[PDB]
């Protein structure tokens, strides 16, 4: 009802990017940590220097934090951040609008024998979460918009709705619905193996939660 779906075509060169993403082979998935603790510290950047001018917008939630959660009995790991959140008009126009160019760039770097690993350099790394997840739900709360739920298992289109589900206060939930072969990044172990190599000077508080069971 009012929470009603409408279903978008992604750009054409995010359609295809996200295809080259999911069909190459390639074995070094673990790059999409980096890339989602990558936004997630910009975003949280972002709330931090906007909070200087106005400290209202903190209202919402003081804290600054990167959780990361593995769930085994539901294949997902979430990463949640208390950043600055995004718009309807992010999810829906912007955010594809921007990548456009990027993802043209990266795709023409690819053929001249770049590699994907280096998507991060081309503004487009959030897509790298279809290194490892099959569907990839995004729950997002920016201040003067109400929640929403973007998802997406790829095949060209995304579907954005209002959420009136748990309110995350401010911020974004990116839930990675992952790949039977993907199981690793269920493990905390695992998870913290690449914080380290990758990760380990964010300048925000990232907890790595240990899953319950295996
Ligand atoms: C809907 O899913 C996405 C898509 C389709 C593309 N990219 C991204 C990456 N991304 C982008 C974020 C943003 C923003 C808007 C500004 C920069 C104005 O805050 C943004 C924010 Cl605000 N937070 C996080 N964690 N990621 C962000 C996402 C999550």
Same mark, same amino acid.
């Given at each position: 009802?009012?929470?009603?779906?409408? #279903?978008? @075509?992604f750009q054409?060169?995010? +359609?295809?990017?996200?295809? $080259?993403?999911?069909?190459?082979?390639? *074995?070094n998935k673990?790059?999409?940590?980096?890339?989602?603790?990558?936004?997630?510290?910009?975003?949280?950047?972002?709330?931090?220097?906007?909070?200087?001018?106005?400290?209202?917008?903190?209202?919402?939630?003081?804290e600054l934090?990167?959780?990361?959660?593995?769930?085994?009995?539901?294949?997902?790991?979430?990463?949640?951040?208390?950043?600055?959140?995004?718009?309807?008009?992010?999810?829906?126009?912007?955010?594809? #609008?921007? @990548?456009?160019?990027?993802?043209? +760039?990266?795709?023409?770097? $690819?053929?001249?024998?770049?590699?994907? *690993?280096?998507?991060?350099?081309?503004?487009?790394?959030?897509?790298?979460?279809?290194?490892?997840?099959?569907?990839?739900?995004?729950?997002?709360?920016?201040?003067?918009?109400?929640?929403?739920?973007?998802?997406?298992?790829?095949?060209?289109?995304?579907?954005?709705?209002?959420?009136?589900?748990?309110?995350?206060?401010?911020?974004?939930?990116?839930?990675?619905?992952?790949?039977?072969?993907?199981?690793?990044?269920?493990?905390?172990?695992?998870?913290?193996?690449?914080?380290?190599?990758?990760?380990?000077?964010?300048?925000?508080?990232?907890?790595?939660?240990?899953?319950?069971?295996?």
């Amino acid at each position: 009802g009012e929470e009603e779906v409408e #279903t978008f @075509a992604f750009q054409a060169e995010i +359609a295809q990017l996200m295809s $080259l993403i999911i069909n190459t082979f390639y *074995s070094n998935k673990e790059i999409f940590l980096r890339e989602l603790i990558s936004n997630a510290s910009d975003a949280l950047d972002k709330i931090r220097y906007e909070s200087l001018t106005d400290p209202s917008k903190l209202d919402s939630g003081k804290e600054l934090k990167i959780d990361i959660i593995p769930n085994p009995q539901e294949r997902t790991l979430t990463l949640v951040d208390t950043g600055i959140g995004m718009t309807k008009a992010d999810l829906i126009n912007n955010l594809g #609008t921007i @990548a456009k160019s990027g993802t043209k +760039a990266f795709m023409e770097a $690819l053929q001249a024998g770049a590699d994907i *690993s280096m998507i991060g350099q081309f503004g487009v790394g959030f897509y790298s979460a279809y290194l490892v997840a099959e569907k990839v739900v995004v729950i997002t709360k920016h201040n003067d918009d109400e929640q929403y739920a973007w998802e997406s298992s790829a095949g060209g289109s995304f579907t954005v709705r209002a959420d009136h589900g748990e309110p995350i206060g401010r911020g974004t939930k990116v839930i990675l619905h992952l790949k039977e072969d993907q199981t690793e990044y269920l493990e905390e172990r695992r998870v913290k193996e690449v914080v380290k190599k990758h990760s380990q000077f964010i300048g925000y508080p990232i907890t790595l939660y240990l899953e319950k069971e295996r």
